Structure 1
Amino acid sequence: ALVPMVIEQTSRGERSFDIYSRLLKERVIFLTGQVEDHMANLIVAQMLFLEAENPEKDIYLYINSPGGVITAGMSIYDTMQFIKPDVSTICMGQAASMGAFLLTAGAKGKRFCLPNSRVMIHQPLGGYQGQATDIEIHAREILKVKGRMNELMALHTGQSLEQIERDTERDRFLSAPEAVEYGLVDSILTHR
């Protein structure tokens, strides 16, 4: 019983799903844990599935994650931007690193966050071992990524690019009210 079952009444009186398929039906997707490749692949499939069911309605994405792989996380980012309905992102627990990046990528005006949550941002990490010639190739690529990530942060948050660059030099922690003032989220949820 790692995942409980729930029963609902439908046209024939009964359907029996788990504790997650039942919520997908209510257009809720959860993103938790490390942003890897298999997990990201599943989230994209779920978002495409919901768009087709009803292109006019919002999709709710709950975020609680420590970070992850950028490449994996750029899928999802591009899907959220490609598909038609708004994706509203809600931060609970934490949104760190790549998690914070996806949090701000939600539809404008719909970037919420619970009151005791934390958001943390920083420049990307990486590394390489090899010949001096190969080291240069790999060093250049990580720097281009750093630059691209900074532009997207500035675009979504409204901060100037230079301000974004200064703020990601070292781990920056923001409390929920600070995320609102900074521009990572639009508001704090209080009570239903």
Structure 2
Amino acid sequence: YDIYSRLLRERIVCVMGPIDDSVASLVIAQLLFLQSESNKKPIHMAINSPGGVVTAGLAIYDTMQYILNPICTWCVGQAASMGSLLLAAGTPGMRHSLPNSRIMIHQPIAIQAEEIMKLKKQLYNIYAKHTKQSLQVIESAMERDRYMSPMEAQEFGILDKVLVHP
């Protein structure tokens, strides 16, 4: 009996490792499943990812917003690139992080020059929406190759609570 099954029975979705179309398919499938069991019971999303494909990450993001369930996000280990975007996409008041985690919002098929900027500005708006920061701040922050502490990411607007014990 897979341990990841008894995790699903507790409404926990693990987003660990890089994010590609294969990972997104599972996460989205698990999210739509838990919604059918209850569109009211909250869902916990554990994040330990260095990023991945943007479209695959945006696929999870729109799915997190589409469903009606509240989503508790937990940053474990690290949440970088698209991983921090999913972290900030949690239900307001339910975005958590463990004390020694690291948060990074800087960005490290084949597309055109105008297309990467379309996605980049598309990322600017999503961050500003959930962190309630200005577009100019997000641009300057994502330009810095740096990690943030859980307390730093709380001051930036990415997460709400840093917990040592429940």
Question: Match of 2:143?
Answer: 169
Provide the TM-score with structure 2 as the length reference: 0.95
Match of 1:29 among 10, 13, 20: 13
Matching of residue 184 in structure 1 with residue 163 in structure 2? no
Task: Select which of 107, 129, 154 maps to 1:155.
Answer: 129
Listed one character per residue, the Cα deviations across residues 105-138 of structure 1 (whole Å, up to 9, x for unaligned) are 0111100000000001114x5976xxxxxxxxx1
Structure 2: distance between partners of 1:120 and 1:92? 13
Residues 181 and 55 of structure 1: CA distance in aligned 2, closer, same or farther (over 3 Å): same
> For each residue in 1:79-111, what CA deviation from the matched residue of structure 2 results, as whole angstroms up to 9, or x when unmatched?
100001111110010000011111100111100
Q: Distance in 1 between matches of 2:151 and 2:85?
A: 17
- The answer to whether the Cα contact below 8 Å between 1:114 and 1:176 also exists between their aligned partners in 2 is yes
- Pair 1:57-2:30 in alignment: no
Query: Is the Cα–Cα contact under 8 Å of residues 126 and 142 in structure 1 kept in the other structure?
Result: no
What are the residue-to-residue correspondences of 1:2-81 with 2, within 5 Å? 17-81=1-65
More relative contact order, 1 or 2 (CA 8 Å, 6+ apart): 2
C-alpha deviation, 1:172, in angstroms? 2.7
Alpha-carbon distance in structure 1 between the residues aligned to 2:109 and 2:75? 26
Residue 166 of structure 1 aligns to a residue whose secondary structure is helix
Output aligned runs, 1:82-161, within 5 Å.
Answer: 82-123=66-107, 138-161=112-135
Work out the number of aligned pairs and report it: 166
Q: Which amino acid in the other structure matches residue 10 of structure 2?
A: E
Which 5+ residue runs of structure 2 have no aligned equivalent? Answer: none
State the AA in 2 paired with 1:24. Answer: L
User: Identity, % of aligned pairs?
Assistant: 52
Deviation at residue 166 of structure 1 after TM alignment: 1.1
The Cα offsets for residues 30-64 of structure 1, whole Å up to 9 and x where unpaired, read as 11000011111011000100000011100000000
Partner letter of residue 129 of structure 2? L
- Root mean square deviation of aligned Cα: 1.4
Question: Which one has a larger percent helix, Structure 1 or Structure 2?
Answer: 2
Quick one: distance in 2 between partners of 1:83 and 1:188? 25
SS at match of 1:112: strand
Point out the structure with max Rg over C-alpha: 1
Give the deviation of 1:170 after TM superposition: 2.6
Unpaired runs of at least 5, structure 1 = 1-16, 129-137
